[PDB]
Structures are given as structure tokens and as C-alpha cells.
From a paper:
To structurally characterize the Pex6 N1 domain, we first used limited proteolysis to determine the boundary of the domain to be amino acids 1 to 184. We recombinantly expressed and crystallized Pex6 1-184 and collected X-ray diffraction data to a resolution of 1.9 Å. We then used molecular replacement with an AlphaFold atomic model to determine the structure of the Pex6 N1 domain. The Pex6 N1-domain consists of two subdomains: a double-psi β barrel in the N-terminal half (N1a) followed by an α/ β roll subdomain (N1b). An X-ray crystal structure of the isolated N1 domain from yeast Pex6 showed that despite limited conservation of primary sequence, this domain shares the conserved structure of the NSF and Cdc48 N terminal domains. Structure-based alignment of the Pex6 N1 domain and Cdc48 N domain shows that Pex6 N1 has more prominent loops in the N1a subdomain (arrows) and an altered position of the N1b helices (arrowheads). The Pex6 N1 domain surface is largely hydrophilic and has a negatively charged surface in the N1a subdomain and positively charged patch in the N1b subdomain. In addition to more highly conserved residues in the hydrophobic core of the N1a and N1b subdomains, we observed conserved residues in the extended loops of the N1a subdomain (arrow) and a cluster of residues between the N1b helices that form a small hydrophobic patch (arrowhead). The atomic models derived from the crystal structure of the isolated Pex6 N1 domain aligned very well with the atomic model based on the cryo-EM map (RMSD 1.604). The biggest differences in the models were related to the loops with high B-factors in the crystal structure, which form the interface of the N1 domain with the N2 domain of Pex6.
The heterohexameric ATPases associated with diverse cellular activities (AAA)-ATPase Pex1/Pex6 is essential for the formation and maintenance of peroxisomes. Pex1/Pex6, similar to other AAA-ATPases, uses the energy from ATP hydrolysis to mechanically thread substrate proteins through its central pore, thereby unfolding them. Pex1 and Pex6 belong to a family of type 2 ATPases associated with diverse cellular activities (AAA)-ATPases that form hexameric complexes consisting of two stacked ATPase rings, D1 and D2, topped by N-terminal domains. Unlike these better-studied homohexameric AAA-ATPases, Pex1 and Pex6 form a heterohexameric ATPase with alternating Pex1 and Pex6 subunits.
Numbering used by the authors: 0 to 175
The structure:
Amino acid sequence: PMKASLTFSLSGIYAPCSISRDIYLEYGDKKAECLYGTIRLPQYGPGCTPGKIVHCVLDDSLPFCSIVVPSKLFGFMPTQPTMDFCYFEPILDNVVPVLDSVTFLINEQLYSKLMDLPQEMQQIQFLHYKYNINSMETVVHSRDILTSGLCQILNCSPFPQGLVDFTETQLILVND
């Protein structure tokens, strides 16, 4: 794990993380569109945030040792500042797993929208237009709050985080 200076993006929970070129160099020959890492934030006193897997993309314009991460990935969104670095670890030997199912807890308005679609394949495609969930690319995580009061991931299976295969992963929708 390396320490990297941290900037929080405010453009959706599933915006990819941007990493500086020195971090990108740690992956070597890996395919530049398929990069993942684990992020943990430092916490009040001992210990740190639990490891969260994210898709990362090179941003050549960032200064050294820098990452940009969505603030919505973590407990609260910054209305006042907090901590100026994170612990970042590239994923090198491993690949990221595909979920068998994802369960969304959604408000009545969104549920009706999803329910006026007779097909499951277009239910995930609809969430893909609303939220930048991309098949076999975006990592989703249990308890992710996509929009306060509208949409939250209740659970994933068999792992608490992983990729969504639009043709394979099962979508479970729960009215709130």
C-alpha cells in the first residue's frame, strides 16, 4: 500500500478513480483500460476505512502521488474538510470478481420507472444510463448510497463488492 494525496470528485459515485502516472507505472504491462486498485482512508485514531476496490484510469495531468476518488464512495460527502491522503494499492496479479446478484433498495418513483420496463436486461441498462454503472467494468459495493433518499445497494453476492455482468448478474429490486 502506498500513500497518495487525495482529491474527492463530486460527479457521481461510480466515476472512475483517476491516478497519477507514477501510480500507473506500478501496473507495468497491464491493459490500460482494465486497471483496479484498493483504497482505504485514514480514520479518527487507530485504524482505517475497510478496503474498497475501484476501477482506476490514468490521468497524465495529475501531479505525482495523486488520486481522485468519488466522495460518495465513503460514509459522508465533504461539506467540511477531513484528511489529505489515502492508502492505495494497485491490483496486479489478481482479477476482480463478477457478482451473481445485486440488490437495490429504491424509492417508489424509481421503482415504478424500473417496473414500467418488462425486461430485466433493460432494468440494468436503465441504471446504466442514470448512474454510469458499466458492464464488466464498474465495481459496485454493498451499502453504496447512489442517491440519498432514492437508490442504495442493499447487498451483493457472493462477495460484498465486484463487477456487474449485464448478461449474467441478477438484479434484485426492493421498494422502499
